[PDB]
Design an enzyme around this catalytic site. Structure first.
Site, PDB file in Angstrom:
ATOM      1  N   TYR A  23      -4.623   9.908  -1.596  1.00  0.00           N
ATOM      2  CA  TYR A  23      -3.932  10.382  -0.381  1.00  0.00           C
ATOM      3  C   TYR A  23      -3.249  11.765  -0.546  1.00  0.00           C
ATOM      4  O   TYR A  23      -2.233  12.046   0.109  1.00  0.00           O
ATOM      5  CB  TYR A  23      -2.921   9.324   0.115  1.00  0.00           C
ATOM      6  CG  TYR A  23      -3.421   7.877   0.192  1.00  0.00           C
ATOM      7  CD1 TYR A  23      -4.402   7.489   1.114  1.00  0.00           C
ATOM      8  CD2 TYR A  23      -2.881   6.889  -0.642  1.00  0.00           C
ATOM      9  CE1 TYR A  23      -4.845   6.154   1.191  1.00  0.00           C
ATOM     10  CE2 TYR A  23      -3.317   5.558  -0.575  1.00  0.00           C
ATOM     11  CZ  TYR A  23      -4.295   5.195   0.342  1.00  0.00           C
ATOM     12  OH  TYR A  23      -4.718   3.876   0.412  1.00  0.00           O
ATOM     13  N   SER A  34      -0.091  -0.089  -4.157  1.00  0.00           N
ATOM     14  CA  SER A  34      -1.312  -0.238  -3.321  1.00  0.00           C
ATOM     15  C   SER A  34      -2.575   0.274  -4.072  1.00  0.00           C
ATOM     16  O   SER A  34      -2.888  -0.257  -5.137  1.00  0.00           O
ATOM     17  CB  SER A  34      -1.099   0.419  -1.936  1.00  0.00           C
ATOM     18  OG  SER A  34      -1.978  -0.089  -0.934  1.00  0.00           O
ATOM     19  N   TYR A  35      -3.287   1.284  -3.552  1.00  0.00           N
ATOM     20  CA  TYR A  35      -4.477   1.840  -4.256  1.00  0.00           C
ATOM     21  C   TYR A  35      -4.053   2.450  -5.606  1.00  0.00           C
ATOM     22  O   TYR A  35      -4.828   2.439  -6.575  1.00  0.00           O
ATOM     23  CB  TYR A  35      -5.201   2.885  -3.382  1.00  0.00           C
ATOM     24  CG  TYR A  35      -6.679   3.189  -3.699  1.00  0.00           C
ATOM     25  CD1 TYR A  35      -7.044   4.037  -4.757  1.00  0.00           C
ATOM     26  CD2 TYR A  35      -7.705   2.677  -2.896  1.00  0.00           C
ATOM     27  CE1 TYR A  35      -8.395   4.340  -5.019  1.00  0.00           C
ATOM     28  CE2 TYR A  35      -9.059   2.974  -3.151  1.00  0.00           C
ATOM     29  CZ  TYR A  35      -9.396   3.804  -4.211  1.00  0.00           C
ATOM     30  OH  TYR A  35     -10.730   4.103  -4.458  1.00  0.00           O
ATOM     31  N   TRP A  50      -7.779   0.562   7.687  1.00  0.00           N
ATOM     32  CA  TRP A  50      -7.831   1.449   6.509  1.00  0.00           C
ATOM     33  C   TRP A  50      -8.948   2.492   6.619  1.00  0.00           C
ATOM     34  O   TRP A  50      -8.744   3.663   6.293  1.00  0.00           O
ATOM     35  CB  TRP A  50      -7.966   0.653   5.200  1.00  0.00           C
ATOM     36  CG  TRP A  50      -7.762   1.495   3.933  1.00  0.00           C
ATOM     37  CD1 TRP A  50      -6.579   1.995   3.464  1.00  0.00           C
ATOM     38  CD2 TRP A  50      -8.774   1.912   2.993  1.00  0.00           C
ATOM     39  NE1 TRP A  50      -6.787   2.698   2.291  1.00  0.00           N
ATOM     40  CE2 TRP A  50      -8.122   2.657   1.980  1.00  0.00           C
ATOM     41  CE3 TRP A  50     -10.163   1.722   2.907  1.00  0.00           C
ATOM     42  CZ2 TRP A  50      -8.814   3.219   0.891  1.00  0.00           C
ATOM     43  CZ3 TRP A  50     -10.854   2.284   1.820  1.00  0.00           C
ATOM     44  CH2 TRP A  50     -10.175   3.021   0.832  1.00  0.00           C
ATOM     45  N   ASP A  80       3.301  -9.527   2.263  1.00  0.00           N
ATOM     46  CA  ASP A  80       2.328  -8.495   1.873  1.00  0.00           C
ATOM     47  C   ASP A  80       0.899  -9.046   1.770  1.00  0.00           C
ATOM     48  O   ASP A  80       0.690 -10.137   1.239  1.00  0.00           O
ATOM     49  CB  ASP A  80       2.731  -7.882   0.525  1.00  0.00           C
ATOM     50  CG  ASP A  80       1.931  -6.641   0.187  1.00  0.00           C
ATOM     51  OD1 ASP A  80       2.104  -5.620   0.886  1.00  0.00           O
ATOM     52  OD2 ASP A  80       1.148  -6.678  -0.786  1.00  0.00           O
TER      53      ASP A  80
HETATM   54  C1  LIG Z   1      -3.126   0.769  -0.316  1.00  0.00           C
HETATM   55  O1  LIG Z   1      -2.925   2.215  -0.605  1.00  0.00           O
HETATM   56  O2  LIG Z   1      -3.222   0.428   1.164  1.00  0.00           O
HETATM   57  C2  LIG Z   1      -4.471  -0.227   1.407  1.00  0.00           C
HETATM   58  C3  LIG Z   1      -4.200  -1.429   2.317  1.00  0.00           C
HETATM   59  S1  LIG Z   1      -5.667  -2.291   2.961  1.00  0.00           S
HETATM   60  C4  LIG Z   1      -5.012  -0.580   0.014  1.00  0.00           C
HETATM   61  C5  LIG Z   1      -6.533  -0.461  -0.142  1.00  0.00           C
HETATM   62  S2  LIG Z   1      -7.185  -1.085  -1.727  1.00  0.00           S
HETATM   63  O3  LIG Z   1      -4.364   0.317  -0.888  1.00  0.00           O
END
Ligand SMILES: *C1(O)O[C@H](CS)[C@@H](CS)O1
Ligand SMILES: *C1(O)O[C@H](CS)[C@@H](CS)O1
Ligand SMILES: [Cl-]
Ligand SMILES: [Cl-]
Ligand SMILES: [Cl-]
Ligand SMILES: [Cl-]
Ligand SMILES: [Cl-]
Ligand SMILES: [Cl-]
Lengths: 572, 572
Positions: free
Chosen positions: A41, A114-115, A163, A256
């Site tokens: 990002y 997250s990612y 997403w 979550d």
């Molecule tokens: C995070 O950065 O937000 C997304 C929510 S579906 C996820 C993708 S693996 O990672």
């Protein structure tokens, strides 16, 4: 206390493709310990994610170097972007480069959300000795199980379409030279993000002209592979976790999307290395502790400075060899809802957990909140059944729970708007005179039958307040073709009774005096999960008119003892 | 593209006291333009405020230096902290020091939000030639008028007690050596922040044992000075603004506590220098565009990258002398609610504004939403009056609007929960067949009488939706002793009729076909404003039992034409 920043340093991968990094390096006479973050990002855009993580400039002022990287094919990096498939190899090559630099002392760690958390598990399986610790927040080590499908074998359709639209939007805004179609594409992407349930309602689901053009992966990988097959198993890290001995600081939230898979990773690594766990009452995009009909108090707000202190102690122990750095820090720290307080524990699952059946019962029909459905620790005395019609054209709407992109900021949602539906079956305890604590993993065992050769069943745990609010806690689904395995599905026989399990993830809640424990049972939860067509066909390729209604039945009594299993804790 | 960071550089003031700064300086062969930020919430903690402002590291990568300072008596700075009183002199001395450094090219600017915005107006009045531009967001140049009291002469009690508790909390967490009382003080401060209306309900209001000990200013300055007297006029900057010629980039929000005063600053400076205005649908702590019963769309989310681009163009023009840097940038940019779209304008107030009276009328009593109250562009034909009892022990609860700390995350709140109260008078238009746009400043003129020698009157503009939602837009209050002046109050005679004005701040809304325009009139709005005692006494020093009820009356007809004044815009 002082430092410097170098932008766009280019790092070569094994195939010659170069990835861009920024280097935050302390004033120091020799080499230092190093922390790595892998981000899709924009590495430049630090304010976008950091408020959900740590005040990490403190790490730099205290003598750590920090490296932030653009993943392959995005922003300043070379190559072409496809989710997940290049991240194992690219992480291995990046860790190796860091270890070869004049400013690295041989000790490396990772952190992020997250990612930026998934990519840490992908790095950990590489076998690079210099990686001494990781800290994955709100993440998973199995991408089928979270966030794209789930333990029940249904597609998480709102997560996928939301997403994909977010990724498409940043691709347009980041272009060097604008294309003629960019302006119109931007408008269409905004329409999806403003109306995710609407986008998910178009049939066949697999026909996505805009998203399929911008990111072909959305159909080629996700929609086209509904079974947990070889394409998924390849990117999964989970089975390799048991053979590792890497310390991990793991964070999760009760509302979550990743909660079930985050908790599983803790259980997988705790026996071989120093694991730690933190769980708050958050959803993926709401870390405030405030919701429309439920407030948890200011203590519930994501505690960023306490998180920063804990991360620094963890890295001091494992990267700097300071043996007493984690003195006084608990193994497990949970926000217990109801009492609305933080509490320390020695393990997850908790030691004294009593896995207790609560049986479905009652006089008359259990349809709607004004029916006769009951819950009791005693097995029911009369054989009965509750019956309803499930119509794919009119599914039960999603309200709170673990939603990501469609109304994903109201986890503990009031369920009263759906209580008058004939396809929502309700079962409740009497009003409680003493408190009951439920903390752990949750599941249901149901005896079921259908007029169709495939269908879905759902279950949802709820806390009923004195004023009438019916607040959601945790939920799950089972798609009947996957009742025994996610890998090798088979159809069912119309009219036959089956005993099935529903995985309802996890929670921590004290049901206080004056409250009731309640369970809702149905056959849909849209668009959190996609809708079953009731045909036995390839669901994502069917038109709404190709789909069938189903007459579904829940059986309850001495010979068919349907129940929920609650993780009961008693503390005097 | 590269830069360095130096921490805790100590800058001497005129009295010898030193303030701490951090220096973010680009790699450069010679001197550069410089931006200054003055912060009472720890200069180290950049993630806390930056998400409400700009991606300002872009400025550094592009060749600007940035200086962030701890204000007097806080964190790394020397001296003693008192709000507002030292900031004019300390800013003057800091600007002078910057201009004397080897790395400064003679051009300085400022940016930031809230307290980081107020401090920019305090810097601008200093007469330092090297200050070439400012950018104050969600701020004020008159501290009586916002945020502590208001144009109506009532105390903004929830804002005062909430902010004071926030300041107290950071003082404890920042102590070098912990005190025995710190642990218990922390618990008590959390109790205030979890229950601001409860804290505001204790009588006498002026007795504050905890907050008065930690921050004596709360009583000594704020509670003890209800008139706009010499103590307030001293810290006010507003009357000096007309004599300046400094460019200003001003940001505001329709549900923000500072909205009225932010807009006034634009009008005060536009004739003498390059002024710019941006207004979104935000409250002070909710910049998402999402609320419990009203969603504005993803375009409404605070546009941080567009804001960054605009700020850089503004500074390039005024600090770097690039004459064409603002080509294509509008003077004014507004988020117009109802249509829910951004729109460019040439001035504020808008050029073609028609200030139009809508008169109060109707058959029977206007008490409650099921009464007979009407609004019309025609003067009413019959002399009538509506009557109610105002009891200070039972005030009308605050719901949305410009709340700061008590439930301050739901500006466009549904008003239905208070519609059955006998002390809430309601007046509505018929259902609209064509759209009506209201964009500008809003006020009311009412003919009123009371059984008491002092009381309050309130007015609130509302958009009624087809489904029944009654959504708040803007509101105001008048405290009767201050009806003619905030400086020299006088009491009223019981039973006599007075014509009074109520300042209702500002809005931008299109009332669409199928909607109604509605106004609510009352005598309280608690705890947004403190409650009138109806005695003529010193309000903050009175016990609840010392207070009186009042019988209040609104007069309407040909000889007493009570009305709201709406800023009507017509665009074909
Ligand atoms: C995070 O950065 O937000 C997304 C929510 S579906 C996820 C993708 S693996 O990672
Ligand atoms: C900003 O930082 O928040 C406060 C809201 S009352 C205000 C005080 S002047 O500044
Ligand atoms: Cl609550
Ligand atoms: Cl707590
Ligand atoms: Cl029974
Ligand atoms: Cl809406
Ligand atoms: Cl727009
Ligand atoms: Cl009339």
């Amino acid at each position: 206390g002082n430092y410097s920043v170098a932008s766009n340093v280019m790092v070569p991968m094994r195939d010659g493709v170069r990835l861009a990094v920024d280097l935050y390096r302390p004033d120091a006479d020799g080499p230092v310990p190093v922390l790595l973050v892998r981000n899709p990002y924009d590495k430049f855009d630090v304010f976008a994610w950091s408020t959900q993580s740590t005040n990490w400039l403190e790490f730099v002022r205290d003598g750590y170097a920090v490296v932030i990287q653009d993943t392959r094919g995005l922003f300043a990096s070379e190559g072409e972007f496809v989710p997940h498939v290049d991240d194992e190899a690219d992480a291995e090559d990046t860790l190796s480069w860091i270890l070869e630099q004049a400013w690295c002392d041989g000790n490396v760690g990772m952190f992020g959300v997250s990612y930026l958390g998934v990519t840490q598990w992908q790095a950990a399986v590489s076998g690079v000795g210099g990686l001494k610790a990781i800290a994955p927040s709100m993440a998973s080590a199995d991408l089928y199980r979270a966030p794209w499908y789930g333990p029940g074998g249904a597609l998480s359709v709102e997560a996928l379409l939301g997403w994909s639209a977010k990724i498409g939007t940043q691709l347009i805004t980041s272009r060097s030279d604008a294309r003629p179609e960019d302006a119109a594409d931007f408008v269409q992407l905004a329409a999806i993000l403003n109306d995710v349930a609407g986008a998910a309602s178009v049939t066949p689901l697999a026909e996505q002209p805009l998203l399929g053009r911008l990111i072909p992966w959305v159909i080629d990988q996700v929609v086209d592979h509904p079974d947990n097959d070889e394409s998924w198993q390849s990117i999964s890290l989970f089975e390799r976790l048991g053979g590792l001995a890497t310390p991990a600081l793991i964070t999760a939230g009760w509302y979550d999307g990743f909660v079930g898979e985050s908790l599983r990773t803790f259980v997988a690594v705790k026996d071989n290395a120093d694991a730690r766990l933190v769980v708050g009452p958050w959803s993926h995009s709401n870390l405030t502790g405030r919701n429309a009909d439920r407030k948890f108090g200011i203590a519930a707000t994501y505690p960023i400075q306490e998180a920063t202190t804990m991360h620094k102690a963890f890295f001091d122990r494992h990267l700097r060899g300071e043996t007493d750095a984690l003195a006084g820090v608990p193994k497990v720290r949970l926000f217990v809802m109801g009492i609305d307080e933080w509490r320390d524990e020695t393990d997850w699952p908790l030691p004294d957990t009593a896995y207790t059946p609560f049986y479905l019962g009652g006089s008359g029909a259990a349809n709607t909140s004004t029916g006769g459905g009951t819950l009791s620790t005693s097995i029911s005395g009369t054989e009965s059944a509750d019956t309803y019609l499930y119509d794919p054209a009119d599914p039960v709407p999603s309200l709170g729970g673990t939603l990501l992109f469609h109304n994903g900021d109201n986890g503990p949602a009031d369920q009263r708007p759906i209580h008058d539906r004939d396809d929502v079956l309700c079962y409740s305890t009497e009003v409680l005179t003493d408190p009951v604590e439920v903390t752990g993993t949750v599941s249901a065992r149901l005896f079921v039958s259908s007029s169709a050769v495939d269908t879905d069943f759902t279950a949802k745990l709820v806390d009923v307040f004195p004023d009438g609010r019916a607040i959601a806690l945790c939920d799950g689904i089972v798609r009947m073709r996957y009742r025994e395995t996610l890998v090798n599905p088979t159809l069912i026989e119309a009219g036959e009774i089956y005993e099935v399990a529903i995985d309802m993830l996890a929670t921590s809640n004290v049901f206080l005096p004056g409250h009731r424990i309640m369970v809702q049972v149905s056959s849909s939860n849209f668009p959190k999960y996609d809708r079953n067509s009731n045909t036995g066909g390839v669901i994502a390729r069917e038109q709404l008119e190709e789909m069938c209604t189903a007459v579904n039945r829940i059986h309850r009594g001495p010979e068919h003892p349907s129940h929920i299993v609650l993780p009961i804790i008693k503390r005097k």
